Design goal:
Four copies of one chain form a homotetramer.
Chain A (H helix, E strand, L loop, with lengths): L2 E4 L4 H9 L7 E4 L38 H7 L3 H7 L6 H13 L4 E2 L4 E7 L2 E6 L4 E4 L1 E4 L19 E2 L3 H8 L4 E5 L3 H11 L2 H4 L2 E5 L12 H4 L4 H8 L3 H10 L2 H4 L3 H16 L5 E4 L2 E9 L2 E8 L4 E7 L1 E4 L41 E3 L4 H4 L9 H12 L19
Parallel strand pairs in A: 1-2, 1-7, 2-3, 7-16, 8-15, 9-10, 9-15, 10-11
Antiparallel strand pairs in A: 4-5, 5-6, 12-13, 13-14
Helix pairs in contact in A: 1-14, 6-12
The structure holds flavin-adenine dinucleotide (FAD) (4 copies).
The site of one flavin-adenine dinucleotide (FAD) has 30 residues of chain A, from helix 1.
Catalytic activity (chains B, D): L-lysine + NADPH + O2 = N(6)-hydroxy-L-lysine + NADP(+) + H2O
Pathway (chains B, D): Siderophore biosynthesis
Family (chains B, D): Belongs to the lysine N(6)-hydroxylase/L-ornithine N(5)-oxygenase family.
């Protein structure tokens, strides 16, 4: 093949839809799951995308693509009432249903296929499957995603504690407890906190929301800042000193630790409403580390330290929801071709401006996992079509889908 | 040489039909337009003015989102899609929509600008239309998209001076602001947009600003989502099947469609009035329930006699400027005179246009785009249903549904 | 006494706090309930007023009076909380709790006292209890309110059907059924429909909403039509021919049949959300009168006629909620004084511009129940302070609280 | 004449104290103000401008809603309460709040206008204060409400030409728009208000418009409700008891406080750039991460040397007009020199303001309004506080809590 995509969607899925009309390119994608499924553990009732529907799979690169969210609604017979709904943001299960509708309309996807290991023979890349099948191509696109992150204070933890990755499946058991505690900030943490707080006077549990963030940061979604999600900002950002880039990565607040401002205010309105009937058994703590964690009987003892104040405190809770983020890890299957991959000074891929990670500037491409190289655009649905069109532009020698070089009104470079 | 159909007039409705029929090789008719190029209501291109419907109400999207004439594709070609994505506004600006349609119009090859239709005949089972210049086109079908010309009350017919209908406001604005008195007659979106524009500079020119309307209130555009479901195929079929007397009642009772103002515009008009009033009394005047009964010019000044209808009292205003935002009205063009016997009429002498949007004896020969409120209610002049109607028209020009045409879209049931 | 207030709704309770600091005025108020209680039974969680908080008991006539809503929050220790909430509309239970707080701080209210008879002897009005006690004064202020209305077609039906006046207390039984129907439109009708919907997939019921109105009318509170809730419009409106005012009263819809537009929108948004999981067992019907209703088994058979189309249809549902309006009926306790009261051509009170209903034009005052003479302003909480200060103006002969003559930017009279 | 306290300066904070002290018989101080009458930041009275805090942040309400000096009472007396009720806007206009403040000061008798305090020393267990006229006022307590004068970067000290600080924009606007080039330095609400004002008329005057700021982003004002709980008594109880190094650190990192823009204003700026750009390229530049390090004037034009700090590159801009929106900063007034021995300072040389808002040896003799970010965080220059701060000051002047003082208002816990 020309290329082989490992892991499908929503970034590699978008590439599948973008190359299907290109006959000059024949690539194939292998996904481990039996069918496409997004973050199904966060499918709370009413939950919606944090980016408008134009950040779908194709539209930002080609609004005429047959796999656009608008065309999907037209086929489902739902376009007109969506027109009446007049909401830029699709609901989460609506988006999950849309990409599954797109994946099943393609012919170049092989589900139930977990790649085992990769290496490099005869200037081609060989990829091995769990079943034993082996594909080969000159290029590979890595869209394996970002596994959930667990703090080391919860390594080797036992009990029924969950990452927010699997909340919907275990809300069954959480509401039956006497006390629930959520660790970390971010959209998922607040969505879960609002969901539990909404029924706190029916199940009767205590509700704790602890985070080390100094504030409950709002998502940085004012339009002048949204212009940093731009081709010309990546051009600027990428040629900065890598330590200043790793500092901008570490300092960034709203990207992974940011809550929708509306959700923040709805949480306050709900706290106000419940507090009319009497004292609400809830706690919201900031500037608080999670240092220790142990399981006894069927309750957890968590040791926190208020870093700013310089004092420790412990809380006990039978339920434990780790709304900690996600973190990319070197996949095991790229061990035999590590010396073809280029690394930075800190131990991760130094992804090039053209989203390549190997000795040739156009060999293996990397979707996501590039905040230290492309900042907030790396895990953004709104920049999936842009990154895929540049990966296309390197697989051919041509620009099949036009690639904008300036979108913003402001200048980031000089 | 005889075509399948001839489109007379190139407004947003016929232009959308042109964009929807271009990928159909089984069809190919021709479009005749008076203007040298596509031009919308340019006399209302006020700074910041925008559409009353979301951008999906473009020429094609609601029938085919993959169409190359989408508004989104237009933004992609001009290098503006990502900035529009950040703008996060469903409503394109008026000049933005005007440039988009002109961009789509010059992408087509089926449009004849600068030709006005003079005659329409029926001969040899075909329709024969002639140009001012004498050019003659023939086709089996006709699609009339002539729009609705501006309406002028009879109290203003044959009136002297420099008074304007709101359709020419931008061209005469620099001369209006020089006057010491300006009066706006009628309600609706355009009247409020003009009032807000003049009120915003009332402090630098020093004119009086009068806004008089016959409607009992400043109606809002009825744009709540359950009422939006009345803009459905379900409601049209319900509505079309009811007695004609009940149909003509409900269009007369229609408030928000032609005489409605965007609620947000109403509230910033009030906010602006609150703002200006802090510095002292502002020379403005907002009157309701007032009909314009007579008007006369003298001294470069107008004397307009009004009657408060429900209070039963008369009064009149003296103003140097006069802006008539009295809306528009369809008049049957005389070029249809040679085939009037071929057309369907109702009790009050208007077109009894079918559910398939047909106005002739065949029920499928001559189609009519706008000017059908008494038959399809608020659907007729709505950009959000231009792709639906064009889909129905294409369905009968062909023998097949080229684009899918929805059966039901709402959660309500209007019939039983 | 100088006046006797019959009934302690928001209007008469407002008059009670506006007259407390006036020493030259000694009035007293008789309420049937043992304490103040607003429209409980519509106290849905999150429900709120339809007018901003300065439409309380005093502020629009005297922002300095100690019975303000803001002073109430200051004493409860909730002002800064309310300040951050930045919402103009208080919650229903919050307003109800506030009015009771003001009522109990007063000296002039006698709870648990139902008035049985009014009479007039030697130029005084004699008011007698059902307990047997007797009060008499020179003036009367009737704040009886407007009791629920039921469309006669449901007179003397068996079952368990309710008026929306009793929704909260019967909700636990309503959800048990498999079919619920709501008749009539308006704010609470939609407040109930949106409450039953949203849990339509946890219980098993079908949900029917049937109204006679042609639209789901929005409570249109655009600021220029809100200027019709002004003294100058009442001066205009009252001096109209009463045939025209009876036409205006009947033909405009929205005052009692209007829904909050944002409530309409989330009703649609919720319908859109539920419909993703499959067809929703709900029906929204317009233009349809309720002509007949029966009850055999635990099921209602209701005969409807869609008057616009001219066709009949019936609906069988175990549950029946009558969200119809409220209607004023002249109380029987004013029978011995009936010939001292003024009536119009249609047989109801010809209320003066000064809100009087008797021959003197300044002896008996009537709160509410004056739409045919004062239009939008009579059942409006925002005009309760205006009307009360005009009542105080006639009792004292002087304007204790300033009474605005004009407030709007437009002119209604010419 | 020996009073209880003498209040120096009459801004919103000391005026609020004047309104909360008038109904207190046990207290009678006196207020000295340089200006002939109250006047707020008039140099930023752009049309439509409004407060950043709701109207309850007036002079009294958050301490006593029944006060006769409340904003709502002011509207009632002015005959404007009902349409403000219809306006349904939490935020008074700047000109509205300014008129409201003069209306309250005129109603009091404790204010001396046109008096400038020149010297304060400590004699006979009393504070003496001397005015420019030479009049003497004596009291044991002082309340310092002199505000914060404008700040000018050292690159602009001794600069020639007609450059202005943003605090005088209204008076210089008519001459700025005449120029060919205007450049705005710094970010924040005022900087963005000025940029939007000039950008709105960029195609009528034809100037180039430059907006240069050192901040890496265009920060929105941190006004989400969970953050707004940080301006609370319990937070500054927690904040004040922190190590001074940590306090000065968090004061320095503060973004939205003085360098934050209203998010709605950011969005309407982008929308306005989108609207103007339709008509062609708009001659304006928005630069960030840029520090101004040198400036000079030659023949009516400024040449400004900037450094993109993050990128590590230099660049220069030439502009005829220079607007410095560089904020404000407190400086110890020279009239406190003879009493410097009695004032408490911290390690970096600033007032070690008590949590009771005192700055003197006795912890209750001299009180400081504003200029206390390093000890009271976002609360010190906030109109939402100041009512709270005045009640605490009155509680130290008296021995009793005259107005209730909240100790907890938030749902979240800041301390452990
Ligand atoms: C709840 C939630 C909501 C979000 N919402 C948004 C939003 O609105 N907008 C936005 O821009 N971002 C959003 N994000 C962030 C980000 O865009 C999403 O996480 C996105 O789904 C990640 O896309 P991805 O393709 O890079 O990774 P993934 O979606 O995680 O794709 C990884 C895929 O690779 C497969 N895989 C794993 N191992 C192998 C293997 N060995 N071989 C083959 N396949 C393998 C996995 O099964 C999976 O299907 C959200 C994140 C979360 C958690
Ligand atoms: C300012 C304004 C804003 C509006 N905004 C909206 C909105 O946001 N949404 C909405 O749904 N509706 C809107 N409307 C209402 C409606 O959509 C418009 O009236 C719309 O432009 C109607 O287009 P049309 O195709 O019916 O005809 P028109 O736009 O009126 O065009 C008819 C064309 O036919 C040509 N023509 C006439 N006679 C002949 C002839 N004999 N031969 C050849 N050509 C001829 C004319 O020159 C003209 O170009 C708006 C109306 C106005 C006035
Ligand atoms: C659910 C609901 C919400 C509303 N929300 C708003 C809103 O947001 N804004 C607005 O402007 N309007 C609103 N209204 C309309 C109007 O403000 C209310 O109807 C209002 O409560 C009317 O109060 P009232 O003083 O007329 O008497 P009511 O509140 O109706 O009650 C009068 C009192 O008189 C007592 N009484 C009756 N008979 C006797 C007797 N014989 N002797 C002694 N006492 C007696 C009753 O016990 C009762 O306590 C709402 C109405 C309803 C039903
Ligand atoms: C344009 C602008 C808008 C703002 N908007 C808000 C807002 O919406 N909300 C908010 O919370 N904060 C706002 N602020 C911040 C802050 O609340 C205001 O700056 C506020 O005016 C500060 O109050 P102050 O009394 O301490 O200062 P000032 O109002 O500046 O008080 C200084 C006064 O003291 C007088 N004075 C000084 N020295 C002497 C002396 N020696 N003798 C006599 N008199 C003297 C001066 O003449 C002047 O009248 C804004 C600031 C600015 C610049």
């Amino acid at each position: 093949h020309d290329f082989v995509g490992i892991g499908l969607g929503p970034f590699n899925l978008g590439l599948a839809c973008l190359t299907e009309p290109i006959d000059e390119l024949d690539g194939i994608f292998l996904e481990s799951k039996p069918d496409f499924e997004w973050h199904a553990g966060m499918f709370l009732d009413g939950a919606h995308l944090q980016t408008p529907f134009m950040s779908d799979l194709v539209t930002l690169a080609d609004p005429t693509s047959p796999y656009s969210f608008l065309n999907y609604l037209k086929e489902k017979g739902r376009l007109y009432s969506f027109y009446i709904r007049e909401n830029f943001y699709p609901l989460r299960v609506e988006y999950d249903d849309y990409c599954r509708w797109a994946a099943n309309k393609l012919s170049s996807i092989r589900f139930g296929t977990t790649v085992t290991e990769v290496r490099y023979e005869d200037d081609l890349y060989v990829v091995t499957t769990s079943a034993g099948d082996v594909y080969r191509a000159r290029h590979l696109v890595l869209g394996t995603g970002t596994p959930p992150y667990i703090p080391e204070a919860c390594q080797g933890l036992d009990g029924d504690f969950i990452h927010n990755s699997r909340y919907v499946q275990h809300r069954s058991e959480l509401v039956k407890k006497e006390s629930i505690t959520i660790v970390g900030s971010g959209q998922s943490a607040a969505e879960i906190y609002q969901d539990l707080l909404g029924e706190i006077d029916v199940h009767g549990y205590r509700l704790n929301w602890v985070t080390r963030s100094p504030r409950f940061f709002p998502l940085e979604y004012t339009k002048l800042t949204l212009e940093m999600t731009s081709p010309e900002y990546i051009d600027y950002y990428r040629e900065l000193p890598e330590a200043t880039r790793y500092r901008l990565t570490a300092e960034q607040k709203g990207l992974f630790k940011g809550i929708d401002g509306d959700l923040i205010n709805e949480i306050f309105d709900l706290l106000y409403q419940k507090n009319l009937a009497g004292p609400v058994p809830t706690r919201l703590l900031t500037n608080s580390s999670l240092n220790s964690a142990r399981h006894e009987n069927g309750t957890y003892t968590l040791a926190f330290r208020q870093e700013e104040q310089g004092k420790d405190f412990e809380i006990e809770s039978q339920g434990l929801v780790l709304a900690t983020g996600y973190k990319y890890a070197e996949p095991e299957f790229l061990a035999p071709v590590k010396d073809r991959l280029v690394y930075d000074s800190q131990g991760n891929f130094d992804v090039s401006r053209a989203y390549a990670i190997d000795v040739t500037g156009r060999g293996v491409f990397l979707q996501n996992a590039g905040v230290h190289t492309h900042s907030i655009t790396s895990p953004d649905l709104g920049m999936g079509a842009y990154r895929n069109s540049c990966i296309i532009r390197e697989l051919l020698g041509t620009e099949y889908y036009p690639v904008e070089k300036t979108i913003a009104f402001q200048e980031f470079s000089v």
